[PDB]
Ligand binder design. Sequence first.
Ligand SMILES: [Mg+2]
Ligand SMILES: [Mg+2]
Lengths: 165, 154, 141, 51, 161, 114, 142, 160, 116
Amino acid sequence: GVHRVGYTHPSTLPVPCAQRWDLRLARARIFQEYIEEKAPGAWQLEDERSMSPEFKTFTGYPMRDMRPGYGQNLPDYIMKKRLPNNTHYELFARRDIPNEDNAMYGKYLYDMTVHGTSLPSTYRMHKDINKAQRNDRKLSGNRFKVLCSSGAKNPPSGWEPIPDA
Amino acid sequence: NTFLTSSVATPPISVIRTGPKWWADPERMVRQKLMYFTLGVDQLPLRRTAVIQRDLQRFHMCKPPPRVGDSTGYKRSRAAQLNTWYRRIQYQEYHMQHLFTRHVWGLLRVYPGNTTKIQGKADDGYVGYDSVPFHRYNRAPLPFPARELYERRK
Amino acid sequence: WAKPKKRPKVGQGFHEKAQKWREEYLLDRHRALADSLRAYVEFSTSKRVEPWDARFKPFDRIEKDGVYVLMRYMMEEKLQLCNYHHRPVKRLFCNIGLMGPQITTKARWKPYRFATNPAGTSKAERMYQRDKTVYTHGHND
Amino acid sequence: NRPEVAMHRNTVGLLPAHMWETDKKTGKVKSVKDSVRDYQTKTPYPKWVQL
Amino acid sequence: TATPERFSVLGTTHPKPKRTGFGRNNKMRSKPSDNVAWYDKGPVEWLPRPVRLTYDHLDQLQQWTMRATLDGRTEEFNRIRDLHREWSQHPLMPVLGDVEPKFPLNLFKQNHRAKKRFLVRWHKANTPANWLWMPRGPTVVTPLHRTNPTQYPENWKQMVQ
Amino acid sequence: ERRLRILAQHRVGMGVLKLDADKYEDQADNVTFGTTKLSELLADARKAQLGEEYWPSVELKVRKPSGQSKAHYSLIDNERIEKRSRELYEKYRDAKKRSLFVTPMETWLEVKGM
Amino acid sequence: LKIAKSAFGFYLARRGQRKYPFLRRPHIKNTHSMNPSAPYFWSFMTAKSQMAFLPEENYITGDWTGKFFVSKRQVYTLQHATSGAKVRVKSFPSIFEFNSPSRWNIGKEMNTLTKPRMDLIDEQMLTKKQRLDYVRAGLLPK
Amino acid sequence: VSTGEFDHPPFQFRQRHTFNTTPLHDANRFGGRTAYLREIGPVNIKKQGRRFKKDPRTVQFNVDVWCAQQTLRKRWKQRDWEVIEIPFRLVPREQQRVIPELYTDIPQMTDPARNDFSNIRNKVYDREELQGVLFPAAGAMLYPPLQRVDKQAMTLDKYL
Amino acid sequence: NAERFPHEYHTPTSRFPPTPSETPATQDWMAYTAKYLDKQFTISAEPAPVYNVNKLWPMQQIPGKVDQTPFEEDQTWLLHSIPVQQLEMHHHEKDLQDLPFINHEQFPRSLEWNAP
RNA sequence: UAUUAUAUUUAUUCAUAUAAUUAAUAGGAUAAUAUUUGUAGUUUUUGAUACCAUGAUAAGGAUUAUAAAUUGAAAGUGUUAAUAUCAUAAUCAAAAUUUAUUAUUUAUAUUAAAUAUGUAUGUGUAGAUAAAAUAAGAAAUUA
Ligand SMILES: [Mg+2]
Ligand SMILES: [Mg+2]
């Protein structure tokens, strides 16, 4: 039925008694509770699937609310929502990275403490060793590529590269 | 009748081959029987069918009896003859069901599914509100609103 | 997994062609929009065929009895105000309450596309004779 | 109004017929007049906005 | 704005062709098909369209049957009795060598349409008016059933001595 | 106790009041928080000792009137209604000389035209 | 991929015609974004509420030198028409300009004013094979 | 222990109207609600459709909302009563206790000592026995008192 | 003019099904009868318990707010303006574990683990 | 020849990718005292790149059978380890269909939250094709 919800103030009753709505406002002050003013009275729908022992999927709690339009957009959804801080997302952010040991310590630090020195990555070492091997037979299939070119283009006052044949 | 739309007809033998799943599903067979009984007519073919099929179901997990080879082929032909008998006993039933159902629908002022005959009322198939604007098999144009088989009072 | 072939270059003067084509596709779309709004509103405003399927009850009954009596004397004005559009018609029948639970349960209504025909529609072919130049989603006459 | 609820409440008064050009025989919109040149409004921004 | 007289590049493009046909890959013609009913053979169209008898219909049936009994209308009961008597007779045991034809192997591959197309076209040709293994006619002696209206219980007053 | 139960709803079970304090990152702060909510909830429940006005109401499911009561609905204003229905019968007898079908709206029902 | 239309042609596999979960396809290609509806005009591919504010992209947020094109989720405003300033949008091949201003655009996003897939096709961006396949589908004349 | 359908059928090859089979979004399922889910016709995949209408999870969610409505609806048609909030004094002896809120304790028996074991939750009171309490202002009783059957009286069923 | 178009301006606090405007005598048959049908009817309303009657229950509502009760009639549900789920669907807690198939788990605790 | 059956049922309009810089360590309240608050030495190298640059896991039924028992296989399907000697092409949104390798909703009621598909009614209708003996229900033409 379409009716006006109504409230009888206890001073007006022929016995004073504590009205359930009044109690509800108490409960809302204590655990601070948003009272949705536009909540339609007609829409009480339990989630049948999870709340009835008749379905194999029965958790005892209302897993989803059955409201078709409801979306991450709405201020109401935003107000009760778990922020991503310190969830698994953070755990992924930190522990899943390309070389897993760089999660535990600075490579240079480790290398310098354990070995006497910084060590190149395995890949780099491969390219290094290969250059040494193939520079020993053929020469001049090569190129000279640096980060900063000035050191080669104007070399120091000394520096007379040994002629090759 | 709630199911009104154009439909696809299946040959009787494939309908019967569904066995327990549809043709002999107990639930369905019982309300056929109800229709006949209510009209005050014995349901013999239904009972023959139910007998045959009941037994089909009972032995449905067994292997067939061992075959000895014969030049005669009398065994093979006798098995076949029995089989087509049973097939025909059931054709007769399948026919009865479609028959009486259409007739009863004629008495109840029911409109059949699209393109369906009801002997006294719609001789050519009855149609209204098809996806296609003409009668499918006549190739004649359909009137709006849907054609009425029965006089108005209820 | 083969190495992807390189895509050929774009075209010469195709940037102009694409600009012009989209430009006047949009200009055209303005009139297509204007016209389809005109159509949509013309449809909302104009009358429709009766939404209920007369082949079932309580509608089959002779037009001088039952539901038709209920309509001629109590509901007529309202049924005409809403132009027999099937949604408000069905709602009015719910609110008249003198039928009550039946509207959805026992009564049958015509399917969507048939119920949308203009009042006066004689042959079924009409569904297909409405204008296709206009973007109303079948809400146009 | 969209078709879901109030569609039958649409009025012919909503159409801006003066904005377009119609064909007499069909009853259809052939062309649209230009909107911008002659367009006068006292409210480019809402009334309460002073920049 | 101001819809132009000419459209340079708009209608310029090649028009999409109308489809020539229907169904799968738009290549199917409009012709008579196996699914087509025949209304010229017997009371049931053939092949029969699907039919769903509901408990709803059974209740309407009961009420019709009752209302008919109380108005002393014996006629539709008699048409129904007739129909039933005609088509419910016991079908005769087939002669050896008589079987329904199967579809020949080594004609099409096993997943081919032809298979079903054969079955349908066979059962379409044997209409229940062509079933000769069920004995219907005036010639038929019917031991299980009553012959005419005069033998049914609502005639009982004439059966009295 | 009744007031305590109604105030903390699903936070009571098997006659044990249970508050789960999650608000702050550190457990210390949650015992502070939890303890506070507890005393604040006790403070409000304890109002039932100030007088009856604070004793929470009982919710009874009270049936609609019975069949027996509803039977009298058809006798409400019996005299007036019979006396009136004779006049209405006159109105009907007269109206039925003019027109084939007499609606209640020509007799006792009012429908405002404009 | 078969043909590389961008860099990603090298990195990505098609995986045949593969199914993705509902409304998550890796690449957002809105072919439908201009899809005419008179009755749904204000609800389709627009803001779910008319009380929402216009997006970020209708505003100059910081100290700018200038932009090349404005974003396509920008909504067309009476000033877009009236001011007579360049309004560009990034479409393909290059850029679409709103040159001929109309009030009929107002209140919709430029997503909706720019046809993503044109009925116009360049024959010069097509291989002879691809042109054949476009003639089969009855698009290109030949 | 309902026999009704609570699950939307899985998408497959197109179902057609047959003996033993009906279309998926046929008007006879879910009380004709399937209207909301239906894309009519030979749908041209490339150009047309509404994606949510073929999606299993979305579709099933919608159906579940509809089922929930059905149950809610029938549970409310099942009520003949209102909840009235009556002060502790004036209430019958059985409610003078403490009554744990719903799902808080074990489902509770009204009066084990008086041989009544039933949910206090679902006990319903007659508007006529609470008359003095609910309408004190009225003077003369508004509802006439219930008439009750003598179970010691010799009546037709006692064979006299 | 916004109130003239009921389905057009939906703020994102608004909820379905919409509530119809109230009507004066509607709350029970006696009141209705008194006001509309038979106007000399002596009992203007059916006896009103002096204590509060909670018509939506168990749901508490704000007093003084015009409201609706869950519908008993199937038609009332079916023909109202309640929408169907259309986009992807969201849950304020469960969104953090993405989909049902990506079921994100920070720690491998037993699903039956019980907080002390 | 004994250790036992393919000729049944249901299907077939199948499309989707973009806006260049990968090179190292560094600790803080409730500690017996470090401004180490603020830790400052350009520049000699060249492959995984848009590019030749070996390895490795897929799919694909054809005769070890019933009892206390699984109807999925190794012969290799982009991403992985010794051949270098053209080039920064990589998603953080809102984007451009030609690609063999894909089960879509078909007529009582039909767009509310991330933006979400306007198109093909045509006698269930060519050719050609797909799937299954496993909690289901099918039975007789081996090498
Ligand atoms: Mg390999
Ligand atoms: Mg980068």
